């Protein structure tokens, strides 16, 4: 009966994780390779490449979701750099549902399954945190660094299934 009351788009200070979330889609063999991630500062939490032709912004849709799902339970800050994801999990998504489009034949939505996979999955976690934060920054804050993380894990999780067949 709606969303999540207690979401939040700043960090929590007694978090239990801290993530950082990235898609990637690339055209790589003529072909549109995409990967998802979710990683802390130093390690790879879980990364995975995605069906061919899968766009960014799903990539990145469903990196957040799979974030929300192993931290279920649990206090979790978790960190994007898409400005899509960010929105859609607070705002769009919600509304989108409500209207009742997302279960609808209407095309004019995309990623309506990434979506309410994603609203069932905001009421896993314990607390949960998603922030914000422009992405690939020059800055040498842990935030930058763990979303450069995160980005490369989703780029590799790409490549990598690319030329293991
Ligand atoms: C091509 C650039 C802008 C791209 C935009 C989408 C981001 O979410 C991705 O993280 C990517 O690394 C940067
Ligand atoms: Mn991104
Ligand atoms: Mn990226």
Redesign the pocket.
Known sequence: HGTRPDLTDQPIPDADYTWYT???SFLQEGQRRAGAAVTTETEVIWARALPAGTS?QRA?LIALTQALKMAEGKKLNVYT??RYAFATAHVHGEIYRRRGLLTSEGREIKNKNEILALLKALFLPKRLSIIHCP??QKGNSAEARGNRMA?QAAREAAMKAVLET
């Open positions: 990235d898609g990637s960014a990145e750099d898409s992405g690939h980005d």
